[PDB]
Amino acid sequence: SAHLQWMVVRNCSSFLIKRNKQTYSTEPNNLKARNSFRYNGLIHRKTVGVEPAADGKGVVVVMKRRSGQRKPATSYVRTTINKNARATLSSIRHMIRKNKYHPDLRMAAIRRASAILRSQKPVM
């Protein structure tokens, strides 16, 4: 279970960094990038990831389907959102709230998606 493998990965994971009195995670689907049970991107059956697109613009939203859990090749579905800064914030919020897909990560997903769009702006 998720709790069972969290008790393995809470201290001896390869994504874990412990320096400068802080702890984080370099996990691929860890939004907010911190080491915790709620935000861990691989122990749960339903995970949400928000990443920048392969090219300059857009936000890729990744979910994990419920069928293939031991099958990591076809486990994650990926969508690309190359739109304005507000309809993507409505879209990801809809994808979480209306689908009831791991609902305690919706504001974290919106806050990550805003940061990616801010990072894709021209610098001053």
Partner: protein, 128 residues
């Protein structure tokens, strides 16, 4: 155009001087690093008036402002570009220090990525 933190509380430090070792002034063999005196007649561990103070637990900094730089940020050591996407969601409270063994060619790329990720660098003009 400085990068402000989320909040900037007033930092209260109970002591700003170092805790020097007893009799680290009469000798070069005695370094400045603190050693607790354990002699039978030692006038410092007996807390006589007008002597070198001892590092008690009462000097401990406030937990809200502990490990926090005078710019209001806390610090994270960064070795490569990948360690900044770690810090992008902790943006307004933690900043980056590029490590000393990082070369100038990669150090340029780290601060270039930190500028667009809006992460503050304590040493952006380090090596060049």
């Amino acid at each position: 155009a400085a990068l402000r933190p989320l909040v900037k509380p007033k930092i209260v430090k109970k002591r700003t001087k170092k805790f020097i070792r007893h009799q680290s002034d009469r000798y070069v063999k005695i370094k400045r690093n603190w050693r607790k005196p354990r002699g039978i007649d030692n006038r410092v561990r007996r807390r006589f008036k007008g002597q070198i103070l001892m590092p008690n637990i009462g000097y401990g900094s406030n937990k809200k402002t502990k490990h926090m730089l005078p710019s209001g940020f806390r610090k994270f050591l960064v070795h490569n570009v990948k360690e900044l996407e770690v810090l992008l969601m902790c943006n307004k409270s933690y900043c980056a220090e590029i490590a000393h063994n990082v070369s100038s060619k990669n150090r340029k790329a780290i601060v270039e990525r930190a500028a667009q990720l809006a992460i503050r660098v304590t040493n952006p003009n380090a090596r060049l």
